[PDB]
Design a protein around this ligand. Sequence first.
Ligand SMILES: CC(=O)OCc1n[nH]nc1CNS(=O)(=O)c1ccccc1
Ligand SMILES: [Cl-]
Ligand SMILES: [Cl-]
Ligand SMILES: [O-]
Ligand SMILES: [Zn+2]
Ligand SMILES: [Zn+2]
Ligand SMILES: [Zn+2]
Length: 231
Amino acid sequence: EYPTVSEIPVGEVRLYQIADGVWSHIATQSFDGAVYPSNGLIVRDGDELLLIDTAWGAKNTAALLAEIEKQIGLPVTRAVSTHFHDDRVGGVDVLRAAGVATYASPSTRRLAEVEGNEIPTHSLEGLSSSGDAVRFGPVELFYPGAAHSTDNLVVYVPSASVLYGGCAIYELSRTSAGNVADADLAEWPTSIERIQQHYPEAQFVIPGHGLPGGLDLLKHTTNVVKAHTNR
Ligand SMILES: CC(=O)OCc1n[nH]nc1CNS(=O)(=O)c1ccccc1
Ligand SMILES: [Cl-]
Ligand SMILES: [Cl-]
Ligand SMILES: [O-]
Ligand SMILES: [Zn+2]
Ligand SMILES: [Zn+2]
Ligand SMILES: [Zn+2]
């Protein structure tokens, strides 16, 4: 049911409806000769849409906007990038040119600039301390602490019990850390525990890449991260 990496040619975007007014978007990208899927989120806010994360590149993100127009037909007015890597900010310029107000924490904006990635225009205040949460229209933004990156945010949709973990949460099929160049391995399990403690009611958990599941993805990610720590 959920679109898999094998079903999506690079350059195309699929949408998957999770609940009333909540979708994920799924794209694929080549990196080091392999193809990876990648998720973001779309949340309806009245007659507008809030977008969480780009579709990993300008071409994918243009296709994302086109696919949103075709399947939902409402304007994306704000977007949030959940950390500074290109699967989250790559395509911010496309969003901006389309009239989307792009947002990220000051930490994310800072790190994107240092890295040479695209920089969301607006700053999300109130998220710089581990455990901080702020409302952003139909979602809550939560900074759990450093994990996959020092700046990574998670997003909760209370009306639908959807927890979007981004790249701090691994899908079950991933049993090895992969690349963790910007991660804080020492803190990642503690940051995951903050997520568990703040959103214990979550029913639908969306990793940054791959298949959704339940809150068991949190323990699974901790298992993988600890195993990698002990390599
Ligand atoms: C900096 C870093 O941690 O990169 C790894 C990562 N973790 N989440 N997203 C990414 C982006 N690379 S990836 O192609 O999706 C990948 C997926 C599985 C294993 C390795 C790489
Ligand atoms: Cl604005
Ligand atoms: Cl703006
Ligand atoms: O990433
Ligand atoms: Zn990342
Ligand atoms: Zn603006
Ligand atoms: Zn990622």
